[PDB]
Write a protein that binds this ligand. Structure first.
Ligand code: HEM
Ligand SMILES: c1ccc(-n2ccnc2)cc1
Ligand SMILES: [Mg+2]
Length: 374
């Protein structure tokens, strides 16, 4: 019986083995330790994201009316000016790995890459990608964890202290002479509010991007004919990005607190309680997608022309008026790296005896990705 916990070691070894069980027999799955309900079905999940008056949310600031419009119109104008930067970042970061013909896309290249991109977005110095990459974890670990050793929380708090002490001077600096980056622009609306937006944009643009790339490569390689497809026609890359997003969404839950007494699915839920949209479940629901547990970049129901917008078929960006602002931007970013990886690592295989693993419950990705090449 689904009394089973979606927070168990058992579940984290493989979320996809239990989604059917859930959306079919306990589609509004209640949790014991947290006082929250886990929503399994597609059309429920979609309705939740579509209605934020009833289902409020908060921003990823936590322990240290809409402005997204200007943020989105930054990312739309900026997207052009960042393309050679995103391009250089990839080329540069791969440079040390080409001689050996061997690499770990998650741990040698991925995280570092995602960081430098966000840094260009915020116009920071890429000499500091390490400090920033490390601090970024600490805060993120805080958000993503169910519990923390007093050490880890002591450590996350530090990362946070450290980050704002780094960014805040830069805000004053640009407040008085802007440039063509986000921080400069957000200053043209309080000092500390700008710190919050930046921070949010730092956590949001960073965690998922590295993750998806690895995922896409992995599943491309695991279906080598589909790989060869993308090798011979590169306009395929988006469908390939998109189908990875549905298959194995990097962000796995999207919270919503409840503004009222309300019902969706079987049980009647009460005021001020928070729910978790299970995105994996939704994108593996037979009711939205045909042969849902099959990776196919060529699926007729992906809806590619809509895959990266406010009203897409898959939901790894969320859905509606409150979806990931950097969808346009993410698209291009992953598009660019993918092509660069594909170009530089001629004949990519998976490493002999490479056994594959995913870790994450709130955000999920490969632990590592051992590819070999020419
Ligand atoms: C790898 C691709 C990406 C995925 C899968 C992804 C996913 C998501 C999801 C699930 C949300 C929550 C949506 C909701 O509230 O329903 C979100 C929000 C957001 N995304 Fe992304 N995202 C991606 C890339 C990016 C990029 C490149 C940016 C660059 C600006 C970005 C900026 C944001 C921001 C600012 C939020 C607002 C959340 C908040 O702080 O209130 N995302 N994204
Ligand atoms: C930690 C937890 C969630 C996220 N996140 C939120 C929206 N897109 C990614 C980023 C870092
Ligand atoms: Mg089909």
């Amino acid at each position: 019986i689904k009394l089973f916990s979606v927070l168990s070691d058992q579940f984290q070894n493989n979320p996809y083995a239990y989604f059917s069980q859930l959306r079919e027999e306990d589609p509004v799955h209640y949790e014991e330790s947290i006082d929250s309900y886990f929503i399994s079905r597609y059309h429920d999940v979609r309705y939740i994201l579509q209605h934020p008056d009833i289902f409020t949310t908060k921003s990823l600031v936590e322990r240290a009316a809409k402005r997204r419009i200007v943020v989105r119109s930054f990312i739309g104008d900026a997207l052009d000016h960042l393309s050679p930067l995103i391009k250089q970042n990839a080329e540069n970061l791969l440079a040390p790995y080409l001689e050996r013909g061997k690499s770990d896309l998650v741990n040698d290249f991925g995280k570092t890459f995602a960081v430098c991109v966000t840094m260009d977005m915020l116009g920071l110095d890429k000499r500091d990608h390490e400090k920033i990459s490390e601090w970024h974890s600490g805060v993120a670990d805080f958000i993503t964890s169910i519990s923390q050793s007093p050490e880890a929380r002591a450590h996350s708090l530090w990362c946070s202290e450290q980050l704002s002490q780094y960014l805040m001077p830069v805000i004053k600096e640009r407040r008085v002479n802007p440039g063509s980056d986000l921080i400069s622009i957000l200053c043209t609306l309080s000092d500390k509010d700008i710190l919050a937006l930046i921070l949010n944009v730092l956590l949001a643009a960073t965690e998922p991007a590295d993750k998806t790339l690895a995922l896409m490569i992995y599943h491309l390689l695991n279906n080598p004919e589909q790989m060869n497809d993308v090798l011979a026609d590169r306009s395929l890359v988006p469908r390939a990005i998109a189908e990875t997003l549905r298959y194995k969404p990097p962000v796995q839950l999207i919270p919503r607190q409840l503004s009222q007494d309300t019902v969706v699915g079987g049980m009647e839920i009460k005021k001020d309680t928070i729910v978790f949209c299970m995105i994996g479940a939704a994108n593996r629901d037979p009711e939205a997608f045909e042969q849902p547990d099959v990776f196919n970049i060529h699926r007729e129901d992906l809806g590619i022309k809509s895959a990266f917008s406010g009203a897409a078929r898959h939901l790894a960006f969320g859905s509606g008026i409150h979806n990931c602002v950097g969808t346009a931007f993410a698209k291009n970013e992953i598009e660019i790296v993918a092509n660069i990886v594909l170009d530089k690592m001629r004949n990519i295989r998976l490493e002999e005896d490479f056994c594959y693993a995913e870790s994450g419950l709130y955000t999920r990705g490969p632990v590592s990705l051992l590819v070999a090449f020419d």
